[PDB]
């Protein structure tokens, strides 16, 4: 009876209703996944199609915060760009006072202290964005971290948010991940990406893919469709 009003108050069951509503708020958004190979980290984003809707290559949830770091985000898009600028401004403070690459561990920790703080106050509101953080460096290596709206900082080799299909991360164990060079990895993930998330719910869709690792020498950028072209090349013939 109103225990979900103030974000600064607990609940009769001893948890935060504001976070419980924030966890499923990210689930209604389209799927954005991530995975890390040995020398690199892979990102992906699904783009839903209802009517048209608009130009392809628009408002992609894939963003680039820093040289070696990138953003695979889900949920409300405007709240993601705000966290994109905060992570960009935080990356600007590190490159200024220090001048080298910001470690992914503490970069996620800075955002972990932010996302957690907004959930504590009833004035502001929690975040409806659950994103993926991953990076690779020559002196660090490939790490991937999963951040949740509750403010828990941690990471696995892979995680999945967005829509509830979750079958696109199943075939990854059926293929070589840490053994592969991250090159063929791009086209190996996209097979079931097309199969599952059936066309009954959404007639058409579109896929974005991004990668950062050794082949780019630590740089992060979205893999072009024309180069190396084998991304969507092998994806169409792997549906069976």
């Amino acid at each position: 009876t109103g225990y979900d009003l103030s974000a600064s108050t607990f609940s009769p069951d001893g948890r935060v209703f504001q976070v419980e509503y924030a966890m499923k708020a990210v689930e209604n958004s389209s799927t954005a996944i991530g995975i890390r190979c040995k020398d690199g980290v892979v990102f992906g984003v699904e783009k839903l199609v209802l009517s048209k809707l608009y130009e392809e290559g628009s408002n992609k949830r894939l963003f680039n915060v820093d040289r070696h770091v990138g953003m695979a985000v889900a949920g409300l898009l405007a709240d993601a760009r705000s966290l994109a600028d905060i992570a960009r401004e935080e990356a600007s403070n590190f490159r200024s006072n220090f001048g080298y690459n910001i470690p992914l561990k503490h970069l996620a920790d800075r955002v972990a202290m932010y996302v957690h703080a907004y959930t504590l106050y009833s004035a502001v509101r929690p975040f409806g964005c659950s994103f993926m953080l991953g990076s690779y460096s020559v002196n660090d290596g490939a790490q991937l971290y999963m951040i949740d709206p509750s403010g828990v900082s941690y990471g696995y080799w892979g995680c999945a948010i967005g829509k509830a299909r979750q079958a696109a991360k199943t075939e990854i164990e059926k293929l070589q991940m840490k053994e592969m060079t991250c090159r063929d990895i791009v086209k190996e993930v996209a097979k079931i990406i097309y199969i599952v998330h059936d066309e009954v719910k959404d007639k058409a869709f579109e896929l974005e893919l991004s990668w950062v690792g050794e082949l780019t020498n630590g740089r992060h950028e979205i893999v072009p469709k024309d180069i190396r072209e084998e991304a969507e090349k092998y994806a169409k013939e792997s549906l069976k």
């Binding site: 600064s8 009769p12 001893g14 828990v152 080799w157």
Partner: protein, 240 residues
């Protein structure tokens, strides 16, 4: 008793009781973890564990062991989101005392300065009480080791051996009879009794890689923990 909107904010009750604060009792239950503290003559040993629902879990990132100072470490319970925001505050005042004072830190009264910030969290108008539970060890000159477990009500608490949490109530029941009587405590004696006190609760007794045993003993005063090597040897030493 409750009257008006008092259910929707953090304040007292018509009977003088509390609701929000007492809903933080089960705030640890969602994490479902356990931490028990045992202290010896020259040594102090902490026992903890972690849950691995998926093989993608990384041992380093999901590690629940937190190190405040080289000489003095710590551990938390409950939801790990609220704990991390208290980690830097435990590091903050630490470095403040290392800088200004220049010695082994308030091994006794440090829980007062931490609980003060923890009380500010509770004393704020609208803010999350941060129900994470702080647990510290200690090292002093010719005082032997110290063990301290703080709760997020804003008070300082610590003793020889203390266990508080979900299932920690049955763990202290064995420690009361195990310590006295009359007995002494050696290095391996405190490590062996870390499992037996939990053996009165659950102790599924599986591969030690999931459980983490914190240990501090005075030879080199610096706190530290081994990896997987002799912890299993201390697990097979207690069982003959």
């Amino acid at each position: 008793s409750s009257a008006g909107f008092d259910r929707h904010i953090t304040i007292f009750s018509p009977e003088g009781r509390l609701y929000q604060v007492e809903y933080a009792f089960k705030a640890i239950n969602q994490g479902g973890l356990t931490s028990v503290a045992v202290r010896g003559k020259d040594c102090a040993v902490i026992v903890t564990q972690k849950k691995v629902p998926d093989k993608l879990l990384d041992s380093s990132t999901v590690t629940h062991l937190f190190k405040i100072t080289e000489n003095i470490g710590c551990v938390m319970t409950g939801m790990t989101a609220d704990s991390r925001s208290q980690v830097q505050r435990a590091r903050y005042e630490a470095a403040n005392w290392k800088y200004k004072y220049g010695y082994e830190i308030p091994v006794d009264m440090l829980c007062k300065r931490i609980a003060d910030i923890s009380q500010v969290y509770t004393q704020n108008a609208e803010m999350r009480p941060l129900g994470c539970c702080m647990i510290l060890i200690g090292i002093d000159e010719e005082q032997g080791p110290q063990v301290y477990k703080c709760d997020p009500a804003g008070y300082y608490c610590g003793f020889k051996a203390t266990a508080a949490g979900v299932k920690q109530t049955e763990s202290t029941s064995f420690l009361e009879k195990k310590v006295k009587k009359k007995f002494d405590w050696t290095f391996e004696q405190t490590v062996e009794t870390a499992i037996t006190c939990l053996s009165t609760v659950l102790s599924i007794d599986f591969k030690p890689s999931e459980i983490e045993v914190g240990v501090v003993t005075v030879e080199n005063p610096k706190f530290r923990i081994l990896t997987e090597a002799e912890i299993d040897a201390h697990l097979v030493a207690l069982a003959e």
